[PDB]
RNA sequence: GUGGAACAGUGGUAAUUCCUACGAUUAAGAAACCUGUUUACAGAAGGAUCCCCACCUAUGGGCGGGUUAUCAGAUAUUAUCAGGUGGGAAAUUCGGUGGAACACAGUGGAGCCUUGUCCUCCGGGUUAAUGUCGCUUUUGGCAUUGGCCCCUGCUCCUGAGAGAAGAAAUAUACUGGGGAACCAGUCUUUACCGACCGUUGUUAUCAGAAAUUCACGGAGUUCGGCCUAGGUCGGACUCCGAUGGGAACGGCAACGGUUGUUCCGUUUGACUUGUCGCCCGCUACGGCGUGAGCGUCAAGGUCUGUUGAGUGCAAUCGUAGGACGUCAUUAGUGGCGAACCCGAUACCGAUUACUGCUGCUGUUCCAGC
């Protein structure tokens, strides 16, 4: 057997939140800063994830016809401002 | 700048020419009609012999001069008479339009010569010629099925 | 000192000029080549109106059976098509990352010892205590002990990259060269004090006293003994000794005390195949048949599982027209858009080959007074 049990009083038990995201199409996760660490070590160790960049994530928002806030909203002022 | 050279692939077609004798009316029967077989005397060597003497007596000295710099038969096999002749990528139209004048060989007349396949690599026209041949079978299949 | 022309060195920067059209297939992936048009649906799932026949009620209507017309956003088309294609160095026999999670030396185990010492940088300054020696509220000098104070230049995981040397100089620490910005090596950087670590071997032959602070000769100072017109002896320091590139703890090569050294193993995979175990049915000593189920293990069976280029006997095209730039003309057009080099998983930094632009520096030639 390869794991380590679990015992209520001396195992940091943590709080784990999933979500789904609606117009992005994503699920979200979300936990406390140093906790995220142990959590996305193991994530691409299964061998069928890979990892992400914002271009990346500009090119998944292109694909799903939805919308980007430093390049595809000019209507705002931060976003006229810096893309301009 | 490497070696860019250029592979050609032909196959030796014969006509049924035959006016005595009617013919049937298909795809795959005049398939089987024009793709029968290849004499006994062919080889590398007679076929490269062949195209040699059409290159000097159709061409001339200094086409064949600029031709046979890298004029080779790489693969070739008598019982598909399909073959591979690599060439310049400049002079590949002066080797298409040689092997387009190729009347009779010495031996055998009565004879046309389809080139197929042009492409820089040799993978790519395998790979090309192994799904020619595949269609080839479905249409022979589907003739020979009904 | 200035302006023009030419050359040289370094730093930064860019490279198919851009756009348009075309390049055979019901054998539906053949211009050379690659990718794309798969999160299946017309609120047509008991769909809507309508035809005939029979039934019940009447001011509307509903049910049952049969053939069955019309309709599903531009009353249409189910069988077409689009986009892209070698770069500043892909090169150079360079280096590192995608294994380490912020030093948690990435983790574990074994062996050895000096057994992993919360230790100590040396050094410099202040303060307190003690003891001695000279002035006499008291101060000064020496030695010990305790406490404090003394510098991450910047980004980055790594590799590496570039900035400045007003705390002693004119050349901006030292040394050598460069024509000058400067280059190389040893170094340090808010240092309001400085700091070239130790060991070993080498500098052959001659020369010289000597080739590594061996020793020797002379002069000066201080101390001790014999001794007292101050003569001699010993020890310590400083300076010098004709030579040779040399006497300068200077130059060259190898080894770390850093938080103990060394060894061993992976954290690296996806499909296909084979075995084993788990739930269902038959049978019951281990058995057998299906889940297009899961976990482990093995196999040079495969890796276009390949990248807004991805080949691997190595694709990265041809032509025509238009726009822009440069140069030469006899009527107005013609030529040119270069060179280096082509990767083979990707990235970054450095070096090297060439063109053009830009700033600085140096040189030569010519004048304005």
Known sequence: ?84 | VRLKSRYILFEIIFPPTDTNVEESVSKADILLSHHRASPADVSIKSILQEIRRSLSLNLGDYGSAKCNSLLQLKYFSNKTSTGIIRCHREDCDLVIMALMLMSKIGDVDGLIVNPVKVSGTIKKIEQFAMRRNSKILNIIKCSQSS
Do not use: A, C
């Open chain 1, 1 to 84: 057997k390869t794991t380590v049990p679990f015992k209520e009083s001396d195992d940091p038990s943590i709080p784990l939140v999933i979500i789904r995201r609606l117009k992005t199409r994503d699920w979200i996760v979300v936990l406390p800063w140093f906790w995220l660490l142990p959590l996305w070590h193991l994530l691409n160790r299964i061998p069928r994830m890979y990892h992400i960049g914002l271009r990346q994530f500009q090119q998944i928002q292109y694909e799903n016809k939805q919308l980007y806030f430093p390049d595809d909203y000019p209507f705002t002022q931060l976003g006229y401002i810096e893309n301009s």
